[PDB]
Amino acid sequence: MKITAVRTHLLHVLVEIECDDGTVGWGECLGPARPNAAVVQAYSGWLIGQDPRQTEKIWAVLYNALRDQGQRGLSLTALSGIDIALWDIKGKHYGASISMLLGGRWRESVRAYATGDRVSDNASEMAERRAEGFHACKIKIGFGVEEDLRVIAAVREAIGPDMRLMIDANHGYTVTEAITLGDRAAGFGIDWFEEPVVPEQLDAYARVRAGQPIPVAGGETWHGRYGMWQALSAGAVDILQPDLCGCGGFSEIQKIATLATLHGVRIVPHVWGTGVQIAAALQFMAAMTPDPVRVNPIEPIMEFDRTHNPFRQAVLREPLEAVNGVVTIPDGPGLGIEINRDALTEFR
Amino acid sequence: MKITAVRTHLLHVLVEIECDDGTVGWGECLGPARPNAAVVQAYSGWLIGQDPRQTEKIWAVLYNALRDQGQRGLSLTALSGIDIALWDIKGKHYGASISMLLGGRWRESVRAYATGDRVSDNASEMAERRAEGFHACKIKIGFGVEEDLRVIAAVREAIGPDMRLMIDANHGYTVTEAITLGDRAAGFGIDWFEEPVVPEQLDAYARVRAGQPIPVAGGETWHGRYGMWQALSAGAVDILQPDLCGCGGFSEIQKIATLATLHGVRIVPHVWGTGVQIAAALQFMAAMTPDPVRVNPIEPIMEFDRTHNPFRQAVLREPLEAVNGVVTIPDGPGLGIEINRDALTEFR
Amino acid sequence: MKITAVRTHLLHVLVEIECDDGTVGWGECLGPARPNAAVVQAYSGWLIGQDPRQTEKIWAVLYNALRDQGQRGLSLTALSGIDIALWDIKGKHYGASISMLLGGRWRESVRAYATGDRVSDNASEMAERRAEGFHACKIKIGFGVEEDLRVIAAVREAIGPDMRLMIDANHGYTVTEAITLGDRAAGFGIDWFEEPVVPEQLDAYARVRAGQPIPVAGGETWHGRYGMWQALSAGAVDILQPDLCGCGGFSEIQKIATLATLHGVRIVPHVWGTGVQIAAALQFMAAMTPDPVRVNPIEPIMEFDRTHNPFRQAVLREPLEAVNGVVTIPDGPGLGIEINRDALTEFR
Amino acid sequence: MKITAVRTHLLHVLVEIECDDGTVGWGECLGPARPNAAVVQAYSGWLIGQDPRQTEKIWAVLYNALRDQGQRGLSLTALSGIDIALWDIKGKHYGASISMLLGGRWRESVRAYATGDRVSDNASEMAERRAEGFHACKIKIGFGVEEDLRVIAAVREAIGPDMRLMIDANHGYTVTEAITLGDRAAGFGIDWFEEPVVPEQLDAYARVRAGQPIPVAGGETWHGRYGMWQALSAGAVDILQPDLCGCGGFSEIQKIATLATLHGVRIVPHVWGTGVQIAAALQFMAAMTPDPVRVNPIEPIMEFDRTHNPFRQAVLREPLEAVNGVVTIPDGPGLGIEINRDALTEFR
Amino acid sequence: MKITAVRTHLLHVLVEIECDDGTVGWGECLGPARPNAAVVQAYSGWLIGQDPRQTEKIWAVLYNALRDQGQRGLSLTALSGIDIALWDIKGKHYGASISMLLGGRWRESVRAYATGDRVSDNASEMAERRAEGFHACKIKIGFGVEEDLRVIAAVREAIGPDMRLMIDANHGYTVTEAITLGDRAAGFGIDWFEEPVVPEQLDAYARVRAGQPIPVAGGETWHGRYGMWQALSAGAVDILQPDLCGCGGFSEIQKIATLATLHGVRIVPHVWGTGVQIAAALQFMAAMTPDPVRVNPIEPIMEFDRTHNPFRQAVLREPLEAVNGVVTIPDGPGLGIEINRDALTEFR
Ligand SMILES: [Ca+2]
Ligand SMILES: [Ca+2]
Ligand SMILES: [Ca+2]
Ligand SMILES: [Ca+2]
Ligand SMILES: [Ca+2]
Ligand SMILES: [Ca+2]
Ligand SMILES: [Ca+2]
Ligand SMILES: [Ca+2]
Ligand SMILES: [Ca+2]
Ligand SMILES: [Ca+2]
Ligand SMILES: [Ca+2]
Ligand SMILES: [Ca+2]
Ligand SMILES: [Ca+2]
Ligand SMILES: [Ca+2]
Ligand SMILES: [Ca+2]
Ligand SMILES: [Cl-]
Ligand SMILES: [Cl-]
Ligand SMILES: [Cl-]
Ligand SMILES: [Cl-]
Ligand SMILES: [Cl-]
Ligand SMILES: [Cl-]
Ligand SMILES: [Cl-]
Ligand SMILES: [Cl-]
Ligand SMILES: [Cl-]
Ligand SMILES: [Cl-]
Ligand SMILES: [Cl-]
Ligand SMILES: [Cl-]
Ligand SMILES: [Cl-]
Ligand SMILES: [Cl-]
Ligand SMILES: [Cl-]
Ligand SMILES: [Cl-]
Ligand SMILES: [Cl-]
Ligand SMILES: [Cl-]
Ligand SMILES: [Cl-]
Ligand SMILES: [Cl-]
Ligand SMILES: [Cl-]
Ligand SMILES: [Cl-]
Ligand SMILES: [Cl-]
């Protein structure tokens, strides 16, 4: 078969790839819509007439094409959208869920965790999330050690002793702030400490890991296999969080997962974007191989953001929803979803 | 679909896996036939009733099952046979060549290299290989520096200045012998120096790489991703040579190829065994991504051994043959081959 | 003298080697019976007519023979059986206990430790072991941090404050689980933490050692001198646990013990298998040199599993038994034991 | 059995150990006679009544006894004499050559190399050695680069192009001298460069190895397993040369050989002393395992010094002699030799 | 001036060197008397007629003379005796205290620390030492963690909360024992932990330093500058304890002190032997440069052993005694002492 058209849509950029036999695949790119769309349009000059089944060859040709333009990250976010759409097309052509094409379904669902006067508001909100059935929540910090600790303390009190708690500083801290925060918050029972410092300073991450006891997580902006491998080599993280729509799509995240196993580093995919990104992430989560394999292994969990969730899921005919804290993974062909075109508006 | 039976055959052990819908896949295991067959028989207790499409899940479950038995290498060679058969089944089920399932066909053929009174015999034989059209040949050394040099010198003279020449010591040398050989043979124009020292001494490999200028190759017995990664980390090789039927099959060699790209280490698959192993290797070679991508990139080449070649290819209805030094890669469903069952004899 | 025959038996594979003068030696191989037997049968083609007294030469020739078959671990487990039988023959020929041939008897006995609604069952069982006289016990974990902690807590309560306690996760944990478990269990008084993570990830072991305070033990599946040395170099363990029937027999475990002394790493031999493996382990334990030598030094202790113990010891005429927690080490020629042939059934 | 007496003799100190059943063993210690004899006398206070068959236990007890006296090297040279005598006793008790007790005879003989107006004298002498049948010779340098080169050049001319040539500076050079010498002499065909710099500066050895291409050898004064391991870890040598009578006897040199295999470093035993030391070295050489095993492997060669050779061999009834460059290895019980007591004079 | 004679005496070997002008110097060697005396006698062959003022030239010539005898430690202990006597002669010739020749007197005295049913006996004895005025004491452990802890606890109770407490295991522990002991004893207030593990395993020392919080001390048997530098490079110790009579005398301990300053490692000289060794140590202590220089800096303290103290000091006319815990440092020419010859008996 052959690609006959590549289109870009908004409402976050979505990539639509149509084939001669009528098969349509959908993908999504991380980051600013316009830069991604321009690059996809550029990529499409070559994609037209190509065989969409050859995802590795397409990936490598397109990735290599944009090397001297300096914008590695943009190449990867743009390629991600194309790559996801292509796997969607493969799944539809072959009659298989992407999770099956990736090597099989370990799980039919994943547990979600909920993400959120800052002290009382977090405490209230997180208390409601627990009532809604979420086994875990993640709270945003990185503003100031003393205030952040007040928030963490109030959230632990509000959610009771059992619900899991993660914290995310979104690179808000200096190393010293992060180490001090981690030392003082550890007593509250924290499963991970996300992006404590700026993402370019991998040795600072390692410093935070060695200076306080909460497991450190990162990776949503560390590009593809090379960026991930640099962080793994520096000992930057206990948990790696690749973004499917940012790191190079299914083709590249498979390679990242391999690297993580060498280091015994857990993968927890970054989930954020429209229903398309979410659908792609869930296919990967279904297929993720436990490290180690055992009865009741450690399994991926899915970030769930009630903020703009209705909006972000409007692109889907059937929303991927958390039911008592659990999200079911589609098993139909490709991403197993149907696009609501009306919700979109075509760009260029 | 479901696996209904797993059978082992001889004539080198071959693995046959039959499914409920009648689909049959074929694979092959490196090493002693009987140990491999026993483990495959053991694996089959679980395989029966499983969905053959779920190759990653099957791989990881089976690999994990044999961990405390101490025999990691045997797990991998046995699993390899199963894994190859399963991909053959996937290809047949999906209507796709394995090379397409692996991500696309970069090439429809590969150049072969020919492998071989030891001085005159090598010189004559290699001179005939050149006349047969092979662009390259590999000669066996590791017996004694002075004698090996005489052989290398006579082969270069006999094949003219253009044909490429590789040498393989099959771990015959001490570090000092290997460094001395490499220093003195380099002037003859040698593309690589295969397995100069014992395969357990990765630092010795690195020593050979740093002490003489011919590129060092190895890997046919370094197990799966972990064994390969140890060699890559030690700086053991310029060229990695994974064996499909030994390292864990298509599932595991894909992961090995990823690792090699981090290090900018070339992959040249080990080719040796029956027509089944050869067919599997060729599917992988078709799909191998150049590192780097460029016009006329460096491409895999295929070891071709005229020794027992008719015998080893008797398992195929249509032999994979070198025509003026070039081997065409099948593009039919799965391995793209048909088994000559009459040539086999079932074991157990 | 000369080897006249090599036979394999079941009931776990046992190796019987007979000599021209009538001397018979017995050994045992770790892992699946059939693969081991096939390789022993293969080895026997050469062994027949060889001088059984030349154990190092035999070891190295046989080990080298199976290098390119990829199955290093299988070579070692098979060789182990042969090697143990050969030392048994040497001891009988020379009129000496293997422990004397290994360099002398430091000790005539060793203290055993006992190995075992999962919470109450462990607590009850371990409470009985203490009453039986065992100075120590080892409990199996690696299922889930919270549940495992409940088990550990109940076992410590049940056995009182004096009995030593070890834990074994059998590679059940991720690094993070293992570090968290170790941190929270340390307060219960734990002498070692066995195989916290998968055995291929040596750096993960080191991570567990640096992240929590219980001493880490491993080694039952790290092959021979090279595998052991990789783990020692990575800082993987505080305690190394080579399996005599798995690592290459007496010839190879002596070399492993040497390596451990360089690193000041304690050796505690893995004990598991039939009475033959147990007998071999005890000969090694008698001869193990303290590190350091002092009055009342740290001494090997022997794992004792009441599970299938009667069965596994049925191969012996006189069972090696724990009497108030202490096992006496035979001092007769060779392994100092007599085989109950009736309990066996010959294979091939 | 039991040791009844330990005696020290001169003519180089010799150690005689007599047992209750009349068995007598002989050993030798490296270095100044009197210090060695005093320590042996001290050791004998404990040795009397001990079982001579327990060589490892005896070794470790005696080695540990002298730790805080500061004189590690003296402990090892003294222990060496005792250890050699004990193995001689074991061999006699058991009816076995030491080479058999060490694990078997790989070889019944070894090739010797010959050791030697300094320019003409070396040239003449080495020319005679070649006529006598020696395959190789070693010349003494370390006096001055220009003069040493003149010597090397004249020796190569005199011995023809085939005879192997080694050089020994006996720590005479600075690093710079050694690198310059090695660079300029390499063209003469030199198999190794012995002790280029002072033995305490292991990093200087490594510097010499990296700065010039002749293989570096050392080790005659690097104590036992720990001293050897430090040199191996520093990358000090291509060839390790332990002295049996200096490094801790057969018990300790076995451990050193193990360490060398990890590093793929060749062992060539230092041979120097009376006929007793030579006899011990030859037993070890018979038993040395090739690294790697192959047809016609690299084998130990024996230093042969015609200087005081008649004198040093006067302690033997039958001299170990080079016949056309080859020395046959005794195969009788123990060291396989008989002592000429008349040649000795008892000390203390 | 010229050396006319060198004599060795007992009552521990003492070295007497007489000069043509009648000047006599005295020194002492660590370790077994007889080996030291033999080497001193050997050294004397050359010393006679040499200028005793040239201590560095003499040191280096004599040290170099014994290199290939393997006995580095013995060279240093023997040389130490000579070197101390030579500095004594220099001081007498020049009219200066050795402490002045070493570069000046920072202090006229040092505080001593006292060294010692094992629980009650230590507690009683240490309680008396406190009453005698010692600011500190050191207790001997390394027998068994539980018993050693009982001792430490009872000693802290008996001596009150202010007196300083050090512990010395004399290499009695495995790494694990030492780490466990240090963790559990730290709460008692321990200034240092001496020789926790065997002195050959420098990495084990480092392991003990990183695994528990009491400062680690060692060095009494690490030879001269090279042995000390290896320990410093390995991060073996917080406190280095060179023995003047063992490490190469004043000439070599000055060099060791220099090395320690690079690493910011404290020097506390080992004090043990006759009054001569004590006198030499005190001269060095007077001259030791603080690291850092400040008002009331950290100063050397002197081990004081009431065991055989009268005996060991019998060699002096005026004993160096602790008065309320403080020892005054002689300021007369040389070692500032007078020998009681009657207490000696000449050897050889
Ligand atoms: Ca709500
Ligand atoms: Ca985030
Ligand atoms: Ca901290
Ligand atoms: Ca032909
Ligand atoms: Ca090969
Ligand atoms: Ca070179
Ligand atoms: Ca019971
Ligand atoms: Ca275990
Ligand atoms: Ca921790
Ligand atoms: Ca002659
Ligand atoms: Ca030499
Ligand atoms: Ca150079
Ligand atoms: Ca008193
Ligand atoms: Ca001490
Ligand atoms: Ca600690
Ligand atoms: Cl659509
Ligand atoms: Cl970018
Ligand atoms: Cl599907
Ligand atoms: Cl990247
Ligand atoms: Cl969401
Ligand atoms: Cl078929
Ligand atoms: Cl296809
Ligand atoms: Cl692996
Ligand atoms: Cl072929
Ligand atoms: Cl029998
Ligand atoms: Cl294996
Ligand atoms: Cl015995
Ligand atoms: Cl190994
Ligand atoms: Cl048992
Ligand atoms: Cl005799
Ligand atoms: Cl024999
Ligand atoms: Cl040593
Ligand atoms: Cl000789
Ligand atoms: Cl005097
Ligand atoms: Cl010494
Ligand atoms: Cl003065
Ligand atoms: Cl030194
Ligand atoms: Cl004192």
mmCIF file of C-alpha atoms and ligand atoms in Angstrom, chain B residues 72 223-227, ligand 23:
data_model
loop_
_atom_site.group_PDB
_atom_site.id
_atom_site.type_symbol
_atom_site.label_atom_id
_atom_site.label_comp_id
_atom_site.label_asym_id
_atom_site.label_seq_id
_atom_site.Cartn_x
_atom_site.Cartn_y
_atom_site.Cartn_z
ATOM 1 C CA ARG B 72 21.231 -18.664 30.567
ATOM 2 C CA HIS B 223 24.134 -14.410 24.861
ATOM 3 C CA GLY B 224 21.398 -11.751 24.692
ATOM 4 C CA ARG B 225 21.036 -8.070 25.549
ATOM 5 C CA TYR B 226 23.009 -8.293 28.800
ATOM 6 C CA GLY B 227 25.951 -10.235 27.368
HETATM 7 CL CL CL F 23 22.119 -11.755 28.140
#
